[PDB]
């Protein structure tokens, strides 16, 4: 007889989204009208290791039947609108 | 028989959204109308190790029936409106 | 027989959203109307180890029936409105 | 028989979207009406190790039936409108 | 028999979209109406290791039936409109 199944996994990984940002609005000496709309919609999403992982089945036997159905269904919708922006000097 | 199964998993891993950020608004000496709408919607989502993981089934049957349905549904809907902004100087 | 199953899992992981942030509003000496609308909606969500994990089943049966349905449903809806902002100087 | 299966996997991997960004608006001393609409919709999505991974099956059966369906559906919809912006000087 | 299967994989990899960026609006001293609509839609998507990977099956059967369906559908739809912008001087 004898059967021998060995799985060795080392995961060191680095998964990132928007990790390091610098954002500035500086120095406005003007004396006229200044209008700024700075990033209306700023999203980030991260999915990792979602589904079916690392499972073990030990199932010896002659006449067995099996029916699996896996579905993953990811749906985003982002909707935006910028209207009347009025900026007037003298 | 003498069946042997080994699963050695070592995990060192970094998963991140928006981890480091420096943000500034500075130095307004103008005397002129200043309007700023800063990042209106800012959403960060992280999902990890969802659904089925690290499960052991030891199940020896000669005539065994197994049915499994596994469905993952992930929906995000975002809606932003910036309809009327008025800026006036003098 | 002597069937043997071993599953050694070690987890060290950093999972994070918006973990370090420096945020500042400074130095307004103008004498002219200043309006600032900072982030009206700011959301951070983290999910980990959801559904089924680390579960052990020992179930030897010659003629056994098993049915399983597993649904994880994650729905998020965000709605933001910035209808009227007015800034006036002199 | 004496069947042997070995799976040694080592992963060091960096996955990133928009990791470092320096963004600035600076030095407006003009005295003339200034309007700026900065990046209105800004989305970053990262997905890794989704669906089925690292699963071990030991299943010796003389006359066995196995049926599987696996469906991955990822639909993203983005809709942006910037209808009326007015900048007027003197 | 003495079947031996060995699968050693070492992964060192960088996968990135928009990793480093310096972006600036600077020095507006004109005194004449200035209008700027910066990148209206800006999207980054990274997907890795989706579907089936790293799965071990030991399944010796004399008369065995196996049926498998695997479908990956990735649909993205993007729509941008910029209808009426007015800049007036004197």
UniProtKB/Swiss-Prot annotation, chains A, B, C, D, E:
UniProt modified residues of type Omega-N-methylarginine: 77
Region (Microtubule-binding domain): 1-90
Effect of mutating residue 29 to S: In FTD1 and CBD; reduction in the ability to promote microtubule assembly
Tau/MAP repeat feature ranges: 3-33, 34-64, 65-90
Residue numbers carrying Phosphoserine: 13, 21, 33, 52, 80, 84
Disulfide bonds: 19-50
Glycan-modified residues: 8-9, 75, 81
N6,N6-dimethyllysine found at: 39
Cross-link type Glycyl lysine isopeptide (Lys-Gly) (interchain with G-Cter in ubiquitin), residue numbers: 9, 26, 39, 45, 49, 59, 71, 75, 81
Subcellular location: Cytoplasm, Cytosol; Cell membrane; Cytoplasm, Cytoskeleton; Cell projection, Axon
Annotated TM spans: none
Implicated disorder: In Alzheimer disease, the neuronal cytoskeleton in the brain is progressively disrupted and replaced by tangles of paired helical filaments (PHF) and straight filaments, mainly composed of hyperphosphorylated forms of TAU (PHF-TAU or AD P-TAU). O-GlcNAcylation is greatly reduced in Alzheimer disease brain cerebral cortex leading to an increase in TAU/MAPT phosphorylations.
UniProt function note: Promotes microtubule assembly and stability, and might be involved in the establishment and maintenance of neuronal polarity. The C-terminus binds axonal microtubules while the N-terminus binds neural plasma membrane components, suggesting that tau functions as a linker protein between both. Axonal polarity is predetermined by TAU/MAPT localization (in the neuronal cell) in the domain of the cell body defined by the centrosome. The short isoforms allow plasticity of the cytoskeleton whereas the longer isoforms may preferentially play a role in its stabilization.
Protein name, entry field: Microtubule-associated protein tau
Originating species: Homo sapiens
């Amino acid at each position: 007889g004898k059967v021998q199944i060995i799985n060795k996994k080392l995961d060191l990984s680095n998964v990132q989204s928007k990790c390091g940002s610098k954002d500035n609005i500086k120095h406005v000496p003007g004396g006229g009208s200044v209008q700024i709309v700075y990033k209306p919609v700023d999203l980030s999403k991260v999915t990792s290791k979602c589904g079916s992982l690392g499972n073990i089945h030990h199932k010896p036997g002659g006449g067995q039947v099996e029916v699996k159905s896996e579905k993953l269904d990811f749906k985003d919708r982002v909707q935006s609108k910028i209207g009347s922006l009025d900026n007037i000097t003298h």
